[PDB]
Amino acid sequence: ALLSFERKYRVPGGTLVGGNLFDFWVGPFYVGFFGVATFFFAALGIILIAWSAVLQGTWNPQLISVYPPALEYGLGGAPLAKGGLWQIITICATGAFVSWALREVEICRKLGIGYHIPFAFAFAILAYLTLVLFRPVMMGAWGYAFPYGIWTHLDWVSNTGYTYGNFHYNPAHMIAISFFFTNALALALHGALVLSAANPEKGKEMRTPDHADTFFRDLVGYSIGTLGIHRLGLLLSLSAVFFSALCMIITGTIWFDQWVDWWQWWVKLPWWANIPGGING
Amino acid sequence: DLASLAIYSFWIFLAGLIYYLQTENMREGYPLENEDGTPAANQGPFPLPKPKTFILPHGRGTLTVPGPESEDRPIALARTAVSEGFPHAPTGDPMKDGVGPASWVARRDLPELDGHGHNKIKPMKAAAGFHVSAGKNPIGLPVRGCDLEIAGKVVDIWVDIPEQMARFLEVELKDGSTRLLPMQMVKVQSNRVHVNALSSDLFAGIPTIKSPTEVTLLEEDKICGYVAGGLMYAAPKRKS
Amino acid sequence: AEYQNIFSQVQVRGPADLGMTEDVNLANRSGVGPFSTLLGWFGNAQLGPIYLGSLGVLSLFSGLMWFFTIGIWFWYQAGWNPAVFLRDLFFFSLEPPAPEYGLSFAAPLKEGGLWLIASFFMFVAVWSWWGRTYLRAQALGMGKHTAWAFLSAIWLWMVLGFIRPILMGSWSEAVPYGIFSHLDWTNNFSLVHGNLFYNPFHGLSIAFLYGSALLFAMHGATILAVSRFGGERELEQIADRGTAAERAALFWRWTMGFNATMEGIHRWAIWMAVLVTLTGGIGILLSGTVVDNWYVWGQNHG
Numbered sequence: 131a132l133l134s135f136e137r138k139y140r141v142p143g144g145t146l147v148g149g150n151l152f153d154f155w156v157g158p159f160y161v162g163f164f165g166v167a168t169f170f171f172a173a174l175g176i177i178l179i180a181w182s183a184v185l186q187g188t189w190n191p192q193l194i195s196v197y198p199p200a201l202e203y204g205l206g207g208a209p210l211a212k213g214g215l216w217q218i219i220t221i222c223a224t225g226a227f228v229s230w231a232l233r234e235v236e237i238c239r240k241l242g243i244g245y246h247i248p249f250a251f252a253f254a255i256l257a258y259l260t261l262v263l264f265r266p267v268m269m270g271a272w273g274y275a276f277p278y279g280i281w282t283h284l285d286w287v288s289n290t291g292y293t294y295g296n297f298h299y300n301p302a303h304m305i306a307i308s309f310f311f312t313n314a315l316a317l318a319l320h321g322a323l324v325l326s327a328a329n330p331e332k333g334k335e336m337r338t339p340d341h342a343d344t345f346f347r348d349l350v351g352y353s354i355g356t357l358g359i360h361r362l363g364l365l366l367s368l369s370a371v372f373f374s375a376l377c378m379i380i381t382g383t384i385w386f387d388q389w390v391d392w393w394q395w396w397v398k399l400p401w402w403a404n405i406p407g408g409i410n411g
Numbered sequence: 412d413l414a415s416l417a418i419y420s421f422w423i424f425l426a427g428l429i430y431y432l433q434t435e436n437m438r439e440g441y442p443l444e445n446e447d448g449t450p451a452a453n454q455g456p457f458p459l460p461k462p463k464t465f466i467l468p469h470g471r472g473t474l475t476v477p478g479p480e481s482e483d484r485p486i487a488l489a490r491t492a493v494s495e496g497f498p499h500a501p502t503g504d505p506m507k508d509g510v511g512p513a514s515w516v517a518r519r520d521l522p523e524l525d526g527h528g529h530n531k532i533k534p535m536k537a538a539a540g541f542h543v544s545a546g547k548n549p550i551g552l553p554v555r556g557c558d559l560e561i562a563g564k565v566v567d568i569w570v571d572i573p574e575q576m577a578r579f580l581e582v583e584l585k586d587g588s589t590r591l592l593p594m595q596m597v598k599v600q601s602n603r604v605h606v607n608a609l610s611s612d613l614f615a616g617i618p619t620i621k622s623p624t625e626v627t628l629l630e631e632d633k634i635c636g637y638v639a640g641g642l643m644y645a646a647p648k649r650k651s
Numbered sequence: 652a653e654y655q656n657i658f659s660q661v662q663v664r665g666p667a668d669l670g671m672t673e674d675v676n677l678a679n680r681s682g683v684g685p686f687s688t689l690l691g692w693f694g695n696a697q698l699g700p701i702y703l704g705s706l707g708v709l710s711l712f713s714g715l716m717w718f719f720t721i722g723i724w725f726w727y728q729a730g731w732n733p734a735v736f737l738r739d740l741f742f743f744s745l746e747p748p749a750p751e752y753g754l755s756f757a758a759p760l761k762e763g764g765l766w767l768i769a770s771f772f773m774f775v776a777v778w779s780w781w782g783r784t785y786l787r788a789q790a791l792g793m794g795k796h797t798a799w800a801f802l803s804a805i806w807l808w809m810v811l812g813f814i815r816p817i818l819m820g821s822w823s824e825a826v827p828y829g830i831f832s833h834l835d836w837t838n839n840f841s842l843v844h845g846n847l848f849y850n851p852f853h854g855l856s857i858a859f860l861y862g863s864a865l866l867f868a869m870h871g872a873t874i875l876a877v878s879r880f881g882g883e884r885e886l887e888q889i890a891d892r893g894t895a896a897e898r899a900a901l902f903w904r905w906t907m908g909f910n911a912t913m914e915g916i917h918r919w920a921i922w923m924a925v926l927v928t929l930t931g932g933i934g935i936l937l938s939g940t941v942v943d944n945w946y947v948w949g950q951n952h953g
């Protein structure tokens with residue numbers, strides 16, 4: 131049940147809501163008021179999802195799919211079988227997510243650490259809200275949201291993309307991808323760096339951080355340092371997801387045409403717009 | 412076909428890999444225990460990994476994990492219920508006792524050494540060539556506690572020579588003794604240094620270091636521990 | 652609020668650090684560079700020194716040759732006009748030889764030869780730099796994690812412009828050097844193989860990419876959350892568990908039911924990132940050599 135050093139940490143307090151009421155654990159897990167909140171939202175949501183599955187007449191997970199209301203319903207409510215169920219399920223997800231974040235906050239307090247983790251998570255939550263709330267509202271129907279199904283959701287991605295041409299040309303999409311790639315790169319090296327220091331060559335003594343710093347200074351002529359790379363990681367990650375939201379929130383709202391075409395602005399600057407030759411002249 | 416082969420293969424690879432990953436993270440704090448310290452009955456599907464021994468750099472010995480675990484300090488906590496899973500209430504002053512968000516681990520009572528075998532962290536007055544290259548130099552500014560009362564002054568910056576990083580502010584109290592304050596728990600302002608976790612009256616309780624030009628892993632933990640714990644336990648004294 | 656430790660609030664500088672000297676040929680290391688106070692607010696302010704050596708120079712020279720060989724081609728396309736060059740910079744493209752030449756090294760220069768030269772230069776640039784990551788580690792007595800991690804990346808690149816073009820029978824199947832052109836090639840590569848979303852490696856690869864972000868978010872925010880206990884000093888924490896490591900592990904145990912150790916978390920890390928291009932490489936390799944259309948394959952499984 132407890133890690134060899136856990137007991138002295140399991141003291142009362144830190145709860146945001148409800149005092150000592152839910153201030154307790156279940157196996158390794160911490161409950162807290164929000165422990166309960168998330169459970170309830172999670173229970174409800176899964177139920178509704180199964181209920182959608184009978185109306186659909188399949189129990190096969192590769193097939194199950196809960197779709198939003200069709201565009202004709204705009205931002206109004208829709209019949210269960212006709213889009214209501216997704217709308218509730220979406221409400222329930224949100225409930226789950228936010229609650230899961232606030233529990234993280236409550237654990238943070240009991241342990242006496244910073245709130246960076248709940249913090250970073252809120253970016254994930256905000257990306258999800260962008261795709262099922264902010265964008266549809268702004269566009270004008272729940273129908274612009276993505277459906278909850280394993281492959282159907284990949285389909286929405288593909289269809290929504292190809293609507294504006296090759297989505298690769300969405301400029302904030304370019305930026306968002308550069309982080310995803312960059313972050314992975316940085317996770318790769320950070321993990322590798324620490325391990326190589328902690329797990330050297332056979333029979334050798336554990337390297338020191340100083341060796342870690344030297345290794346990079348030797349490799350590319352600069353080392354951000356131990357504190358740096360952790361600040362770096364948090365940032366690349368949060369940024370990747372920040373730009374991911376951005377590229378979507380603008381798509382279909384302030385730009386509805388082909389993304390490639392938006393680049394004509396550059397190429398049509400009057401100082402070289404008419405100069406012959408090249409690719410565009 | 413080949414493709415089918417490859418993907419089935421991979422899902423198998425991936426499964427033994429997680430297994431590996433998982434057993435490696437079982438190198439500390441395992442095996443599990445009951446609230447009374449007796450070994451718990453259900454330790455999960457995963458076995459303890461076979462021990463590994465770390466050879467430490469400045470003839471400081473070896474470390475073998477997993478290995479015999481022991482807190483090596485008495486814990487001042489008492490059960491608040493008759494069944495498992497409820498908090499344990501401090502039986503004294505959690506701060507003074509070092510439980511809760513004020514907990515510290517019995518790390519070695521030796522300082523962390525640099526790549527050369529010198530003390531990694533030093534008061535800047537003893538660090539030959541170091542200076543505040545940017546930002547507000549704290550040195551000389553009053554330390555204000557969450558109760559909005561002055562507790563001491565900044566009489567030096569203990570720097571991390573290898574990372575050229577400020578780790579702690581050395582604060583002079585009203586009785587002429589000094590304490591270390593983690594850099595990460597204070598806001599350096601234009602005319603003062605503000606500490607939200609501790610009220611002026613608790614600065615004296617901050618554990619002291621035995622030698623004035625060195626800190627040990629044990630003393631770092633006891634200090635950081637203490638200051639962090641203020642956040643929850645000084646709470647009645649904090650106003651804003 | 653409280654202080655968050657995303658940016659330093661006081662910079663402290665000392666004599667330039669020339670580093671650990673283990674088995675390293677000190678003759679090759681450079682001189683210390685300046686110090687960016689800019690950088691200093693985020694991480695380390697000290698630039699340099701850097702280790703040159705034989706492999707560094709070869710790598711660094713081939714590296715520039717590659718880049719320049721592409722550059723002259725762009726200029727030739729731009730009508731040597733600096734204005735067009737700027738206008739049309741992302742439209743220019745150095746394309747592989749036509750399918751006609753196959754795996755031939757005899758394609759005319761304007762018709763694909765120049766692409767081979769550039770690649771040959773890149774091939775050399777990259778491998779030497781790989782050997783560089785390895786040696787730099789050896790000379791400090793360190794594990795070779797970094798070189799092996801690097802090898803994963805190399806895998807996907809090897810497969811894209813070398814191994815797959817060769818197994819298909821022609822260089823024309825490789826990726827063109829160009830900003831918009833390599834985007835198009837990607838988009839088109841999926842169309843031709845029946846939508847890469849049905850390539851289960853592609854799907855796996857995305858999971859590990861998404862995951863890398865998830866994890867580096869988790870790890871980073873955690874270490875920052877406990878830096879108030881010297882969390883960032885991970886090697887000593889491994890060697891002697893501090894409260895930092897404890898609070899870290901527990902926050903996570905209490906949230907989701909299990910947890911890492913300080914050495915452990917970094918194994919999760921290196922593998923989550925390395926699996927991105929590992930799986931990736933495989934998904935692409937089978938694409939068009941063994942499987943012509945992932946949707947059809949998806950219907951049968953064979």
Ligand code: BCL
Pocket residue numbers: 176258261276280281283284287848853854855857858859861862865
């Ligand atoms: C954000 C970008 C796009 C999108 C584009 C894609 C693309 C492109 C792909 C996926 C893939 C996946 N997507 Mg998606 N996906 C989106 C939004 C979502 C949402 C959401 C609520 O917002 C979720 C939960 C998922 C979940 C998933 C997984 C089924 C799968 C692997 C992801 C992964 O490894 O992440 C990293 C996270 C982890 C490793 C942590 C553990 C995650 C586990 C796997 C979560 C599974 C949840 C799932 C089974 C449903 C549970 C819900 C109920 C409680 C039962 N996507 C939006 C619309 N998604 C890949 C796939 O192969 O699936 C077809 C794929 O190729």
Ligand code: BCL
Pocket residue numbers: 287311314773777804805807808811836837838839840841846847848850852853856857860927928930931932934935
């Ligand atoms: C229309 C587009 C198609 C499609 C077609 C492809 C194709 C084609 C490929 C991918 C690939 C990938 N796709 Mg896909 N993909 C689509 C939609 C998506 C979506 C989505 C819809 O949300 C997502 C999230 C992804 C995500 C991804 C990545 C997981 C994956 C590449 C990982 C990587 O990091 O490589 C980045 C890393 C590298 C390329 C390694 C290179 C390393 C070298 C050595 C670097 C050298 C640098 C050089 C020498 C210059 C030096 C630098 C200078 C000094 C500055 N795809 C659709 C279906 N996708 C790749 C893959 O693996 O697929 C299975 C791939 O080949």
Ligand SMILES: CC[C@H]1c2cc3[nH]c4c(c3C)C(=O)[C@H](C(=O)OC)c4c3nc(cc4[nH]c(cc(n2)[C@@H]1C)c(C(C)=O)c4C)[C@@H](C)[C@@H]3CCC(=O)OC/C=C(\C)CCC[C@@H](C)CCC[C@H](C)CCCC(C)C
Pocket residue numbers: 311312314315318319322349350710711713714715718776777780781784797798800801802803804924925926927928
């Ligand atoms: C495991 C997967 C991820 C990964 C890992 C990875 N990559 C790696 C490593 C590892 C573990 C290394 O050790 C190695 C490295 O040394 O990094 C520091 C590398 C590396 N990955 C790199 C790039 C890279 N990795 C990528 C991807 C990924 N790498 C994956 C996501 C990508 C993409 C496309 O996503 C890129 C672009 C290099 C930084 C480095 C390998 C360097 C190399 O091989 O150099 C060879 C040649 C040269 C010396 C060329 C130099 C020519 C330049 C001077 C021209 C450009 C001039 C330009 C205009 C300059 C200005 C830039 C401004 C920003 C200031």
Ligand SMILES: CC[C@H]1c2cc3[nH]c4c(c3C)C(=O)[C@H](C(=O)OC)c4c3nc(cc4[nH]c(cc(n2)[C@@H]1C)c(C(C)=O)c4C)[C@@H](C)[C@@H]3CCC(=O)OC/C=C(\C)CCC[C@H](C)CCC[C@H](C)CCCC(C)C
Pocket residue numbers: 168171172175176219222223226227230234247248250251253254277278279280281283367368371861862864865866868869872906907
């Ligand atoms: C912001 C950067 C990245 C990030 C960070 C991040 N994620 C995080 C955190 C952080 C910092 C956490 O602390 C938290 C965590 O605890 O991790 C272990 C979390 C987490 N990220 C998760 C998943 C996740 N994160 C993702 C993405 C990312 N997370 C980013 C790329 C993704 C994808 C698709 O990329 C996924 C799948 C969880 C493992 C965990 C949060 C767990 C949680 O919220 O529990 C509460 C909810 C439930 C128990 C289930 C609720 C059931 C619903 C009511 C119904 C189901 C509806 C759903 C909409 C159906 C979708 C079906 C699909 C097929 C489309």
Ligand SMILES: COC(C)(C)C(=O)C/C=C(\C)CC/C=C(\C)CC/C=C(\C)CCCC/C(C)=C/CC[C@H](C)CC/C=C(\C)CCC=C(C)C
Pocket residue numbers: 718719721722723725726767770771773774808809810811812813826827828829830833
């Ligand atoms: C300012 O102007 C001057 C001229 C000074 C410049 O220098 C400007 C230069 C620029 C304009 C340069 C611009 C360069 C880019 C736009 C480059 C973009 C490159 C990419 C987007 C590349 C993407 C993908 C590349 C891939 C996957 C390459 C793979 C290569 C290989 C695996 C190598 C394979 C080897 C070959 C075929 C030959 C092997 C032969 C043997 C004998 C072994």
Ligand SMILES: CCCCCCCCCCCC[N+](C)(C)[O-]
Pocket residue numbers: 205206207217218220221224263
């Ligand atoms: C966090 C809330 C998320 C809700 C997701 C969608 C709910 C749609 C609410 C509309 C209900 C009725 N209406 C049209 C009268 O407003």
Ligand SMILES: CCCCCCCCCCCC[N+](C)(C)[O-]
Pocket residue numbers: 429851852854855858862922923
């Ligand atoms: C590092 C361990 C975590 C790995 C995450 C494994 C779950 C990913 C599930 C992806 C679903 C994939 N597939 C093959 C059907 O496309």
Ligand SMILES: CCCCCCCCCCCC[N+](C)(C)[O-]
Pocket residue numbers: 156157158907908909
């Ligand atoms: C993917 C999530 C995995 C989480 C693993 C959690 C381990 C819990 C150990 C069993 C505890 C049991 N319980 C709840 C019945 O008391």
Ligand SMILES: CCCCCCCCCCCC[N+](C)(C)[O-]
Pocket residue numbers: 429433454455456457908909910
């Ligand atoms: C895709 C990520 C999935 C994470 C893998 C799940 C590992 C669960 C380990 C549970 C450990 C149980 N224990 C011993 C803590 O009680």
Ligand SMILES: [Fe+3]
Pocket residue numbers: 320324360870874885917
């Ligand atoms: Fe780390």
